[PDB]
Design a protein around this ligand. Structure first.
Ligand SMILES: *SCCNC(=O)Cc1ccc(Cl)c(Cl)c1
Ligand SMILES: *SCCNC(=O)Cc1ccc(Cl)c(Cl)c1
Ligand SMILES: [Mg+2]
Ligand SMILES: [Mg+2]
Ligand SMILES: [Mg+2]
Ligand SMILES: [Mg+2]
Lengths: 236, 5, 236, 5
């Protein structure tokens, strides 16, 4: 693409600059260019990729929710006909969101996942695959909605299986994966009991492993454990 | 909304 | 452009939706499309146009300042050579900013200003012209930098002359114009004394006119008067 | 930075 002529190292440098400038669309385009160089990503570079697209799609999701709310209000009883504009603009944002998700899923499929052999990279990419199918599922309404949901589930499940075999229960990637798969259960799969069970079991097993950790690893793990607790408090 | 990372 | 096939009223409706969704790039593209329909803008529509581009260029300016700071640190003594990347990316953001300013100035020149006969519209558009030349001046370093600064000054000055003749001293557009022209003096024209004099005289003359106003007009005017006071406190 | 509107 348009980044084909820029050095891989320069793309990574500029992704970091874009993050400092809060220019997340730029950050994501730089990291897309870096991935398309075809070399595997380091731990730090995987973080840059995920931060960039998380911020881009997060803004799109927030906007889509605002517009969907307005659209559903317009379809209530006693609401005045305002024309097709709300649906059109919600569809515009929705299409842009789907485009970003398809781009990320394309990077994972070509060819990040198939070259990821270590648990830390493979679980990370499969969690991402689950996340971006989850975002597609949030806006899905058509013939393939169940298949999108199952694509998210399958990716999360493979990541979970690897993480339980190959990572300690305090590993932040394992914890973050469980956090998000639990939200998938609660918000996408209509399975609140599974969501609560997963968050609780993940929290308790991490708690019992904290004694093995340094001060800095303890900080990293307890940060995500608190998010598990926050969700459990929201749900119970 | 619930927390995700 | 790409908005040529959309109804003017639909563009205005979607600009309002984009504002609610905090999608200011979209908002600006919709309002550009509305302006290019060739009809004059109402008071509310002028507000939509200015809010949209103020947010877009405001984000670009914030990003440019972050990158310029990093760039100037890199050029200090004892700083390691990091290559051309910081300058390149600052230039990229700078070029995008200049593009937005040129777009706004193009809308004002073709043909918003020449059709604006009432004081409220003409002063508003000339203030905008001063503002977007001011943003160009913030990043200018070349042969035409003095001419960009004088273009900002000339636009602000014409707006001031009209506002003093045709608007009460509490009029919010007159106040906002004086606020920004004062900042132009302080930050662009190296004239802090003129900046302070203008802010003080504008504040005092508005204060003496508040007694003529309703509760709601009083709220509108005192809001901008407080910004004049905030700047005076910053500068004295 | 100073306030502008
Ligand atoms: S990768 C960005 C830096 N890491 C974090 O902000 C914390 C964190 C922990 C676990 C996981 Cl899976 C993610 Cl994506 C982020
Ligand atoms: S036009 C957007 C609504 N108005 C404001 O937010 C307050 C205000 C007052 C004076 C001026 Cl010149 C501007 Cl641009 C905005
Ligand atoms: Mg190379
Ligand atoms: Mg759709
Ligand atoms: Mg028409
Ligand atoms: Mg330049």
């Amino acid at each position: 693409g348009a980044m084909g002529s820029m050095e891989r190292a320069s793309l990574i440098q500029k992704a970091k600059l874009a993050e400092q400038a809060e220019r997340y669309e730029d950050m994501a385009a730089f990291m897309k260019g870096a991935v398309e160089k075809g070399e595997e990503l380091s731990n730090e570079e995987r973080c840059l990729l995920s931060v960039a697209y998380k911020n881009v799609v997060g803004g799109q999701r927030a906007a889509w929710r605002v517009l969907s709310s307005i659209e559903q209000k317009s379809n209530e009883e006693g609401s005045e006909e305002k024309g097709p504009e709300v649906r059109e603009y919600r569809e515009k944002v929705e299409t842009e969101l789907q485009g970003v998700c398809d781009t990320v899923l394309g990077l994972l499929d070509s060819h990040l996942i198939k070259e990821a052999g270590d648990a830390e990279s493979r679980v990370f990419y499969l969690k991402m695959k689950g996340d971006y199918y989850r975002y597609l599922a949030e806006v899905a309404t058509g013939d393939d909605k169940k298949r999108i949901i199952d694509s998210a589930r399958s990716a999360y499940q493979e990541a979970m299986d690897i993480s339980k075999k190959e990572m300690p229960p305090t590993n932040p990637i394992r914890l973050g994966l469980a956090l998000n798969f639990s939200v998938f259960h609660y918000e996408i799969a209509n399975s609140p009991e599974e969501a609560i069970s997963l968050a609780k079991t993940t929290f308790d097993e991490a708690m019992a492993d904290l004694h093995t950790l340094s001060e800095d690893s303890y900080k990293d793990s307890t940060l995500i454990m608190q998010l598990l607790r926050d969700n459990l408090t929201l749900w119970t | 909304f619930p927390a995700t990372v």
